[PDB]
From Swiss-Prot, chains A, B, C, D, E:
The chain crosses the membrane at residues 31-50, 60-81, 238-254, 274-287. Residues 51-59, 255-273 are extracellular. This is Bestrophin-2. Changing residue 264 to A: Does not affect subcellular location at the cell membrane. Decreases ion selectivity. Its main location: membrane. Belongs to the anion channel-forming bestrophin (TC 1.A.46) family. Calcium-sensitive chloride channel subfamily. The gene is BEST2. GO terms for molecular function: bicarbonate channel activity; chloride channel activity; intracellularly ligand-gated monoatomic ion channel activity; ligand-gated monoatomic anion channel activity; ligand-gated monoatomic cation channel activity. The keyword Aminoacyl-tRNA synthetase does not apply. Ca(2+) binds at residues 9, 292, 295, 300, 303. GO terms for cellular component: basolateral plasma membrane; chloride channel complex; plasma membrane. The C-terminal auto-inhibitory segment (AS) modulates the open/closed conformation of the channel and determines paralog specificity among bestrophins. In a closed conformation, the C-terminal auto-inhibitory segment constricts the channel concentrically by wrapping around the channel periphery in an inter-protomer manner. Pentamer. Interacts with GLUL; this interaction tethers a fraction of GLUL to the membrane, causing a decrease of cytosolic glutamine synthase (GS) activity and inhibits the chloride channel activity of BEST2 by affecting the gating at the aperture in the absence of intracellular glutamate.
Length: 366, 366, 366, 366, 366
């Protein structure tokens, strides 16, 4: 994921114009091979029109430039690009909200599954490893960067998510489908065993763990749904036709003709159609937005860092439920225990922009 | 469902242009009969204009080509296509999220309904079969591919979802409406019987089962709502008129006239209007997107695989609540039990793209 | 509601073109009186131009046809129609999801309110009648078809939703507002009485009934909100002006002039502007979409069948909580009790389209 | 709020054309002063062109009419109006769903807080008054019509929402911010006191009251968020510039020139540009839609009736939790106690439109 | 945040035209440097065309003005601006709803965590400080104005959110990632300690605190997701190219040529292209809307007041859970204890606009 949020914090003079010189995840990284092909077919059509095309067919070619330019319907391309791309960014953002994060589950495990002994932390470490295993098994199904890290189940056993004796349980289940759900059933069999032994003391404390797991698996179940049910291929191919057929009538219809032939609106030869290549940055570059986000789990520069989130949500959960269980600082009085205004002080930099009176509503004329 | 997600993982040079040669669920599979009819009425109008139409009516026909081309309002067709199709893909995706999946219910049944004996697994197998029966009864109402698998209720009894003695209970309920809800009431009468016998030990454990069933039936209730309440026929017929009346003024208005007659912008004869057929791929093909997703439960190639999800969610639930109930591997220490960094190792392929420092926020200039 | 979902299951050759011959809920049922008025003012303007208009004002009329056609801004009408109609279909679908359905409440009443005696079924029948009464009282406020069935409260008492002695309780509450909430307060006073008597055994079982009622009343409360807060009249009148003022400049600007006068683009007389009436099907018919869904509770053919849902959700709830309470078939083994694959068999028709290998993810190259 | 829902129940011949004669909340009530200014600057520019402008500058003025008409970009105004207004109607409807309604809380108070004595109804009346006070304190902050009813806190004490001794508690909290939250903390301190005294019998009954209050305050917290965080002023000023700069190039570019001067497309003098004023109804009237809904809590005719909802949700809650607590009619048998079909009868008017067979699904060919 | 809601309460004559003279957060504050550069390159191109450009290249320059004006595709810029900006305002508003507010948690802490002694208020003050610390640690990661207030963790310790002995616990956790979650795990370890000691009396009272914390942290977790996963840089650069390449063909294509040269539509010299600068307010100003909301946590005038919400939600929570715990006014009878109509009185200003009869539904013809 290309993060440029700190560059665009405040709207400056050169706000978005400094963004046109970046390379990682940019438009020029995706379109430098297509503009070489577009100039490769434009210069092959102009150098043949000046040199190869003879005079009887130079008149016929000029009858085709005025035919292709009038059919260059550049308006209706913007709606089959406009409505298709916002369908894509809607699915691209909903695929990130469906990423399996164990952060809502690591606060319930550390709050409900109790015990300071070896078995007490073994329950909290295995419950979070079962959540971490079920996120590895679904991300290695939908993302190429995780599958290159875990090509086999033995690469998951060697990584520490699965043990050697859980793989005998995992591989002896006669199921012809994907088995990312398996660790989520091991979560329920272990949370019901810890509830029976008294590790989970209350009854609502056990219900919250099974509530917060169905929020976590549905996230694993949605990633399998977005991977299987993509956008319709008939709807991807319409947008691909509409851009490339516009760029077929514009490859010929924007050819620079001979001025002395005597044709309307064709009186110059720029030697390079610079306001046509800038249409190729805008029309074809709008398609390359949706080419990058149609599968955000690949290995593009602006794709989702799925291997970052696996190592993060495996380390910060084992830190939270094993090393941070019931290890608190002792309770002392706050800095504003006797002050009726718990107002934190300011620095010198954020000091004179903070003199506005408090907004209390639109009707109170302050 | 046509899945092409692995082809479009990273944006390449020939990224979406390789998609224009696929056949299953494509645009050419849906439009090869219409372009034959469109060329069948274009070539019947051109071969009559050169040969059948005499000179007094060849002048009158040329007065009609310039009349139909100026009314070829290709711009306003893109908005009655643009706003109607995104209404359709919104309903097409919401009909997939309303698909009855028993995965959120198979984790509560294996966690709350207990017992290792024959009656203990008979409760878990009948509770999941009642969820699986209520998904069969609603999918055979809304989807053609399931109704060809279950034309009668006896085809559901022979398949194993309903027993022979439950059909006497199912068919003696004097109700003139659809009875997909029936197994969801059998779920509540069986979950309250297992709670009374002590199979469901806690009180919040019984409340979670009735909570997770109302999430499951509302999914069965939404599929009946999308099947009954389709998009308005007055709104389908406006889009169908607007495309086919544009293609009536474009069938005549884009005719290739005689150049020597002396008319503006009509100086050539391509013998095949290739930039008009490419408008037929884009305008009529945009309508065939919404023709395929207006009922996604049919038997198209890009329709929902409803019979896959019936056999999957009947097999993986009976595997989870009967064979996987309280059958865990024994608890042992993890690979990172003494390591303060639970960091899984990497392979050689995903090795040198993983050297970025960890993103901690936009304000920390790293 | 006009349901045509079975006709549009698979995209055929004549897929949407068979829809243009339907009559119920169609475009021709709504626009046959307006095209008679539109031709009534077009033919009154043409037959006066040939016969009534003399030569000094036939030149002045021709100066007005070329003035009205250049102001025929057919493009900006499509956006005040495009954005207004999708606001309308968004409210039209959200008014159907806010329809009071007692199906999520009939599963909690049959699962929590217990008792096989006369008082045990009287509690379940009165709790569901109080939900059914509160849906009648809100639908007779917002829908014309229910108010013609229940013009007075005595028509609700005679129908069986309210008793004769509940109407004395209903009509002696000194409230000047709508009283659809009243039965939802009778639900809470009866669910707390059954909980106190031991009919509702558990404490979470009583909390689920008050949870599922606030989901049900908010649905009754949303129908009162959509009925009171419609779309803004200033926003309805802008779209009505923009279509009818476009059809004023197009009623005169698309008049067929005399060819020998010598004017550009006016060289024919079709005797009937067929590509202008087809613009009246598309522009005015787009407005008649939003004319039908601005109040979907009327008595149009494509309006909501509110009287169907009253009789359905009153019959299937009394069937579920009175005749179906704790009346189950006895537990027996399933058809796949010893088989590790619970795979239901197929027919002969859905037999050879089911040979695809199971999709397990995009990265597994199968 | 202007409610016209009963007029638009069924799509008639004069369906939306009867709406163009209404006055309350209409387009003519908002635009009668602007069309007087628009004609005031059009007639001041035409009567100066015929009379004041001499012949050497009548030629220069005619060079400016053809310059302003070609820059009259009426297309791109419809998208900065189209996307801005649907952002506004999205916020205008979400501000109505965030209106603090005590109806979901009056059913939990009457169901959980018990007692028939004086203290038993004093708990239910004070808990609902604390919800009603917290809605008054947020609506008098965000709405002008409530602030004109409660300019001071003593106008709230005299109205009965706050007592004289609660104002000493309210005004001695040293907080410089808005204090609409205060009564919601008084709700929790009173619900925990009634739970301790045994007025709230169960433990889940107390959890539902604190659950349903956080749904109620977040509604009060969202109204403070929409009042403080409006739409961006840079995004309001772009739409205001784009309409008023289009109406500057159209004020001059649509001037009726002298026909004998010899200019293209300018051959008449209508003496009043009627298809330009109809563009002022459509373009400027689209802006006046968003001028009315940018703050829906003012005192327009189509604004939210906030003082209606204060008096309604203060009267129907005190009626529900004080006069309607545990005052039920006695349980008797329904009208369909022995009938297996609980089908309510029909009238004579809704009698022959009810003969359709019941829809059971798309696949059942009925 | 620039709040102007009180100015736009009612739609007046000069409603939005008074907004075009504001300066804070306006369009002129963001675009006064770009119109100086745009006039700086327009006047450098006109003063070179009159004076520097000689007659042989004054003819070649005039061949380029008519070439750049025909490629000035001002229509397709409005859709790559229209669909990109509403993606931005969707993320800008969802980043405000994901702001960590402790108001839903301060009502559960004051209602469940009990005790009037020193340890009883120390539990409520430390639980709310742990929520307030976790909002400081995520806002100093994503917002520049908070990071200038807390550049180090010692600036948070000196401010009072963290103690000196909690920083030893905070900095000895060997984690290479962001540690905003840490105080949310300290919340669970303290809420489970207070539940064990009997400070939290009930079991559902403890479950509500862990429920309302996962609502609060997911808000802290969403701010880290919006900061890391911005909009795609390929999609920001397409919109930046499309505006700046339109303003390259419009910088040259809208040049005022010499009238006597003899070119179509170029007959005047305004000496300042006022309807082109007004296109720069509309096209480039539409981009500066999305330049300000792409990171709403900076230090613009219309950015989010993040330091206001830190001091507010730290003061009003310590006021609610420490000074306002179980300190109620005594219960007395309301003003409408014997009146069956709890109708609050009106003033004189809001007196004669309140005579409408109560809306009870669309079907009741009142
Ligand atoms: Ca990708
Ligand atoms: Ca289909
Ligand atoms: Ca209707
Ligand atoms: Ca207003
Ligand atoms: Ca900013
Ligand atoms: Cl609960």
């Amino acid at each position: 994921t290309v993060t440029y949020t700190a560059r665009v914090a405040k709207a400056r003079f050169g706000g978005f114009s400094k963004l046109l010189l970046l390379w990682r995840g940019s438009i020029y990284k995706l379109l430098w091979r297509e503009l070489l092909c577009f100039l490769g077919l434009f210069m092959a059509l102009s150098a043949a029109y000046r040199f190869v095309l003879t005079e009887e067919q130079k008149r016929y070619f000029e009858k085709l430039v005025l035919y292709c330019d009038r059919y260059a319907s550049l308006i209706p391309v913007s709606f089959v690009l406009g409505f298709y791309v916002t369908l894509v960014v809607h699915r691209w953002w909903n695929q990130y909200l469906s990423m399996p994060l164990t952060d809502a589950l690591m606060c319930v495990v550390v709050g409900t599954v109790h015990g300071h002994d070896e078995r007490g932390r073994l329950y909290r470490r295995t419950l979070m490893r079962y959540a971490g295993l079920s996120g590895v098994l679904i991300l290695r199904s939908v993302s190429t960067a995780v599958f290159k890290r875990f090509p086999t189940i033995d690469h998951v056993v060697e990584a520490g998510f699965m043990t050697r004796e859980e793989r005998k349980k995992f591989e002896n289940l006669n199921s012809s489908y994907n088995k990312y759900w398996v660790p989520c059933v091991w979560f329920c069999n272990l949370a019901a065993q810890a509830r029976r032994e008294g590790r989970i003391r209350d009854n609502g404390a056990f219900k919250l763990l099974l509530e917060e797991l169905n929020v976590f698996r549905s996230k694993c179940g949605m990633l399998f749904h977005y991977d299987w049910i993509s956008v319709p291929l008939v709807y991807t191919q319409v947008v691909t036709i509409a851009v490339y057929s516009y760029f077929l009538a514009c490859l010929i219809g924007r050819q620079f003709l001979d001025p002395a032939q005597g044709y309307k609106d064709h009186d110059l030869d720029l030697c390079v159609p610079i306001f046509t290549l800038l249409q190729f940055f805008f029309y074809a570059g709008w398609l390359k937005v949706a080419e990058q986000l149609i599968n955000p789990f690949g290995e593009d520069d602006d794709d989702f860092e799925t291997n970052f989130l696996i190592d993060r949500c495996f380390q910060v959960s084992m830190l939270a439920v094993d090393e941070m269980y019931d290890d608190l600082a002792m309770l002392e009085k706050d800095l504003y225990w006797d002050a009726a205004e718990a107002r934190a002080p300011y620095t010198a930099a954020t000091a004179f922009l903070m003199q506005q009176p408090s907004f209390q509503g639109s009707t109170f004329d302050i």
